[PDB]
Amino acid sequence: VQPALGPANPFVTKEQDSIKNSITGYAEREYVPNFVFNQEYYANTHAIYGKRNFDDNEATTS
Amino acid sequence: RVWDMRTRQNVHVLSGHKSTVASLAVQEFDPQVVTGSMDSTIRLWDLAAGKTLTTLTHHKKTVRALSLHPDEFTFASGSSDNIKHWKFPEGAFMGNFEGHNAIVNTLSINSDNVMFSGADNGSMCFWDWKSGHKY
Amino acid sequence: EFPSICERCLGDNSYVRMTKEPLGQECKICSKPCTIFRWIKERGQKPGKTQICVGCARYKNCCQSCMLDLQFGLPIALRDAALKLVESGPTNDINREFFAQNQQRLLSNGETAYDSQEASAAARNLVKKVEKREXXXXXXXXXXXXXXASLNAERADYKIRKHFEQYGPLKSVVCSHRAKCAFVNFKTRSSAEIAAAASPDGNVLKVQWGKXXXXXXXXXXXXXXXXXXXXXXXXXXXXXXXXXXXXXXXXXXXX
Amino acid sequence: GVARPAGRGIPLGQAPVGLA
Amino acid sequence: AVDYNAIARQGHEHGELVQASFRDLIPLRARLGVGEISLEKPSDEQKQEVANKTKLALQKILSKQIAQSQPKSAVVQQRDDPVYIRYTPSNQMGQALSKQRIIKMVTAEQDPMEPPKFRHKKVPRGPPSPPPPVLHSPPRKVSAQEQQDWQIPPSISNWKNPKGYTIPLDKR
Amino acid sequence: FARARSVFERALDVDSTYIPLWLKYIECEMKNRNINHARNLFDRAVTQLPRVDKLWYKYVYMEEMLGNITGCRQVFERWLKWEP
Amino acid sequence: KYNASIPFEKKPAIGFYXXXXXXXXXXXXXXXX
Amino acid sequence: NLLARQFEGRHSTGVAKQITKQRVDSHQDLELRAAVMNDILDMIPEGIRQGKSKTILQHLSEAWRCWKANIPWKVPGLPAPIENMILRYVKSKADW
Amino acid sequence: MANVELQTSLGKILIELYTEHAPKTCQNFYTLAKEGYYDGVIFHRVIPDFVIQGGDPTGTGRGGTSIYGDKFDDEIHSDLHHTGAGILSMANAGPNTNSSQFFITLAPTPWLDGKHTIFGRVVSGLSVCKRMGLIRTDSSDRPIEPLKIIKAVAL
Amino acid sequence: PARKQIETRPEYEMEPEQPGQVYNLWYNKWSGGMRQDPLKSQVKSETRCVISRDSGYTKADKNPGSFFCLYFARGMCSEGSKCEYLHRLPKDTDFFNANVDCFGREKHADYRDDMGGVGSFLRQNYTLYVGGITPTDDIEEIVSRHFAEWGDIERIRVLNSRGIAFITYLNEANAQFAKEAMAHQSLECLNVRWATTDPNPASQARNQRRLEERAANAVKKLLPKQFLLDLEETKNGKXXXXXXXXXXXXXXXXXXXXXXX
RNA sequence: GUAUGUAU
RNA sequence: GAUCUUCGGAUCACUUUGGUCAAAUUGAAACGAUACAGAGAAGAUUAGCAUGGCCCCUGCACAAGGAUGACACUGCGACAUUGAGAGAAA
Ligand SMILES: [Mg+2]
Ligand SMILES: [Mg+2]
Ligand SMILES: [Mg+2]
Ligand SMILES: [Mg+2]
Ligand SMILES: [Zn+2]
User: Fold this and answer.
1) E-F interface: how many C-beta pairs under 8 angstroms?
2) How crowded is residue C104: how many other Cβ atoms within 10 Å of its Cβ?
3) Is G10 on the interface with E (CB under 8 A)?
4) Where are the WD repeats (chain B)?
5) Which helix (H) or strand (E) holds B46?
């Protein structure tokens, strides 16, 4: 780990503090099997629709 | 211009000098490419990057010769001024062969430390690479 | 090597499928070949698209689609006028190609960042800079014209609209700053009669009942009404303005 | 198959591969 | 001269070999503060490092030249591995901070036909890297007889004397 | 300012070692009186070419009119390291 | 009864000494007009 | 090749003209009149004004012309160096 | 109660050491200066109107050790505070983690009182600490030209 | 809900300039003599929309982040009731972002020569350039009647010498919206164009001042509350004692002080 | 009176 | 839905949408009409090659044409003085 050490710059606004590879945020490569990503993506969307729908629509079942 | 033997296709434009690049020399190790011009200058070149390392200006007129010493790791630059004589990576100056009063085109180096400089008068002075004395 | 793109456009979802296309449109500012990045935001939304090359949206510092500045959220033009931070100014067809290429020449060689502390100091300074800057004889002659729905508001437009609309149904409203007057026309006379008595001697007023060369005559009438308001609060130009003030009323009565 | 030397990059993020 | 030699160096992006002092005109035999002069021509294990460095570099350029030179008619390749990524955002405006968001990049596969998508705009080239110190030997004395001995009389033709410019017959 | 102070800079890229451009560019600053502006620009030349005597004399001469004498010496000292 | 935005800028050099010099230069152009 | 011309236009002015028979006599000269612009620049010492660089040529030519006609070409005081410059770079021409 | 002289690439800095207050803090600093430990080290942090820290042999940020072994305890007194511009004080990574690293304030710092061990104040070279603290930096507050410590003399 | 102003629509076929415009299959226009007739001479619109009568609910209203229909402002949105895009005026809430014109069409680099239907994203214009008919001095009653309906106005100028008007607007969205609706209407057809910077120095400074004020308001939400607390506190004090007290307490800087205590 | 450009 | 098999319970199938406008004046060629002027080399007629680019068209073209395609600058100066005479300011 080895911490930095020092007084820490006091001025530092919100915009400087994050470590960013590409301006907005850090971006790095990933290796997720696609089926997991597709499976993950749909579940998230339903939740977003549900809030807009305002309906929970129960739980997924057999 | 640096050309690719096989595919007959230029790779590099060594863009910098501002006039007739009247001489070249080429090596295995860095400073692989040595120019010399009417600018009365010399660069030492990155064959990978296409950019100049050093920028060696100690001449006053057109550099009508370069040449690498067989073993020594050194390169004499000529002209109608001081027939200069240099080191490497930095290039940092070494000495001046002094005594040629003409416009010299040729800096031919030998294995047994003999230069030959022929000028546009026919004046042919042979030199000695350790001292500077022309014999 | 994904794009700039702010958080604001990517949208509600965490996972986002998007497609690059290595040589689509040449950038608008930059005017040179770049990569188009396309994606969807929501369910039945029409999909996004990056409009700028990264080389530029480095310099300009904004969401390669939204173009809203990353720090604040205001537009890029709005930002450069007010804050005046980097002070860019080509705004041409051809000069803007080179100028913006010249900044890409600058930043690429020597990485001169967009300092956010000094940027924020410009804003808090601009905030404080805003705050420091900031009758019986009438009604009788009025009623004589009423017997024989528009009010002249003598002595800004949005406030003139606000204070008059709340006293009846409006037909239309006017203003002239050089004129320094506004003719408020109502739909009914009952409202215009009520609004006259309500807005008499009020701040935001003379509320009566309404009735190259044009620029110089109206600009002359501005200097006349300016000295007319200044005198009442408290010489040759004042007398000459009185002669011009008398000459206008004679033309109005005769016509 | 071919070999190479070292490197051992550090990831800024933690947590599993698929989540985020 | 300690804080001023960083005037000639400014810019360049590679200026540590640039000259500065009078020392630079001084031969290597006299620098004063020099242990030993190495005239030998390095080694074999650098020779083979360099040759690898150069040859790999040229190849990446030559390949990309061949790509632009020929448009590769019908030769359409699908880099068809969906590149997955995670993107850690840096408190941009404020608010939500992180999450990390996994982007999934894909290459839209260019229609074979469509011709080039933009014109060749011609714009004047940018300005060069600022120059270096000149460091000449000291200018030699000339004399007024020498500068007269290089007097060049304007020549005048037997035939090609265009424009006007009349010349008397005793100057021919 | 800009249009003027760019054009000389722009033209100095085309030929560094033209002395008559160097000077012309210097004089036009001090005719509008910004000395600090010029004192950097004067240094640039000095460095860029040491065997241009015309620059060296003209470097100090400005200094006397300007004032402080301790500036003149540090300037005059670093001309003696070239040992003319 | 070229002007728009300068042709090609080429900034002076570097901050060694210069903000006060620019302050007086801006108002002078208005007087010259 | 024709389509790319139609959605791009022609590249920057230059490319390369590749001699041919029409433009050989011209381009021969152009080089000679820039290898005398070389040799003078270097024949002239370290401070004797460059108002001769262009000037030397109008002799060269007149010299050449003089040869073709067979008239001799004595010239009042010019540097015996630059007499030869020009007797030499004529002799070349008079071969080719 | 002995002073120390620092020779940098900009100018010379003389500093009093309050050894009467802090014996160990002025035992560590004084020993390394004489040994030739601070020689050729860069002031790796520089902040306009705050500090210019130093004491990094590794040239990283996470470097430097003490003469004792690795890290030693702080010694705070209410007599010594950060009221001024040019105050020598030891940097740290918590309560009890003082390495060789020190720093020189450029303005008053009330909020650093009670955390860091103050052990001296700059007598001569106050012009050097103001000029050194206005150098061009990268976004990681590192100077673009490495401001070296040439020699550490112990007076 | 909604009104379909014209159910039928318009089908385009033409032979202008009688003897052969040819038609350039590449870019769908005709080509012949009398290019001056194409530059000028635009023919009056067949319909204008009335706001109160036509406006209503849509399929867009249900969707949060939609645009307005271009054909609504033209006054011919054949769909009307079941139109995909909004059928109202742009309010302060509607918002939008930089590179997008209110109607969805993307903005461009830097204007047209003749000033077209969309403007640049490099400079902001809340204004409108017009060319109108001139009966008497009741023109200003006519102008203020119509243009006020399309949106909240800042200031109507009407030059009587040259029949022209520089109409600024409160919301930038109304300006883009206003130009389309006003354009190609009778009070010849009114001519609507984006406004060049008005001549003279004083006026520009006045406009610059307004834009700067607009920016300050936009920034103002952003700034920290303590910074917000200050300027406001100082103005109220116009306090010193309080400031002094604050200073004493102080003696990520705020965060660091907070962390200590 | 065009080859070729300048203005609306 | 189909196939096994307790009415439970399996198993097979899994997120479309090549978009510079969502409806041909005001966001992607200019040429054309008209008017003027009306074609290099120091008499007049006349072939040409080059030359330099922020000018370009025709052409697969690193041929060739397009008037030799068209367009094309030439004060300064890095300033000494000499010796005499007159003038105003210290
Ligand atoms: Mg031709
Ligand atoms: Mg001809
Ligand atoms: Mg012909
Ligand atoms: Mg030609
Ligand atoms: Zn771009």
Assistant:
1) 39
2) 19
3) yes
4) 16-46, 58-87, 99-128
5) strand B43-46
Q: Is residue F59 a contact partner of residue F82, using CB atoms and an 8 Å limit? A: no
Please provide residue C59's backbone torsions phi and psi, each rounded to the nearest 5 degrees.
-55, -60
Chain pair A-J, CB pairs under 8 angstroms? 9
Catalytic residue from among I21, I44, I82, I116: I116
Which of A26, E112, E111, E104 is closest to C20 using CA atoms? E104
Q: What experimental approach yielded this model?
A: cryo-EM
Question: Going edge to edge, which strands form the sheet with C16-26?
Answer: A25-30, E83-89, E102-107, C16-26, C33-39
Give me the DSSP letters along H8-76.
T----S-S-----STTSHHHHHHHHTTTHHHHHHHHS-SSS-STTTTTTHHHHHHHHHHHHHT-----S
Measure the CA–CA gap between B129 and B70, rounded to whole angstroms. Answer: 12
Q: Which two tokens stand for residue G33?
A: 């007009």
- Give the phi and the psi of residue I88 in degrees, each rounded to 5: -75, 125
Separation between Cα atoms, residue A37 and residue A34, nearest integer Å? 5
Q: Which pair of structure tokens corresponds to residue I31?
A: 């020993």
Tell me whether residues A13 and C116 touch, CB distance under 8 A.
Answer: yes
Separation CA C211–CA C234 (nearest Å): 29
- Chain F residue closest in CA terms to E24: F82
Note whether B40 and B61 are within 8 A (CB). Answer: yes
Question: How large is the C-alpha radius of gyration of chain I?
Answer: 14
- Strands (DSSP E) contained in C27-169 are 33-39, 150-154
User: Could you tell me whether strands C16-26 and E102-107 are parallel, antiparallel, or unpaired per DSSP bridges?
Assistant: parallel
**Residue E51's closest chain B neighbor by CA?**
B28
CA angle I98, I104, I110 (to 5 degrees): 85
* Nearest Cα to Cα of residue I57 among I45, I72, I69, I39: I39
Radius of gyration of chain H (CA): 19
Q: Where are the domains of chain I?
A: 1-155
CB I26 within 8 A of CB I90: no
CB J25 within 8 A of CB J49: no
Cβ-contact C86, C27 below 8 angstroms:
no
Contacts of B120 in chain H (CB under 8 A): 39
Q: Indicate the residue of E85, E92, E118 with minimum beta-carbon distance to C33.
A: E118
Q: Where are the beta strands (DSSP E) in chain E?
A: 83-89, 102-107
Nucleotide nearest to J101 (CA to C1'): L21
Chain J neighbors of I76, CB-CB under 8 A: none
Instruction: For residue I41, give both structure tokens.
Output: 């080290």
What is the distance between the terminal CA atoms of chain D, rounded to a whole angstrom? 32
Alpha-carbon distance of F62 to A60, in angstroms, equals 87
| Phi, psi (deg, nearest 5) at residue E17 | -90, -10
Place of tokens 């009565």: C253
Taking a C-beta distance cutoff of 8 angstroms, is the pair I105, I82 a contact? yes
Domain I1-155 falls under CATH 2.40.100.10: yes
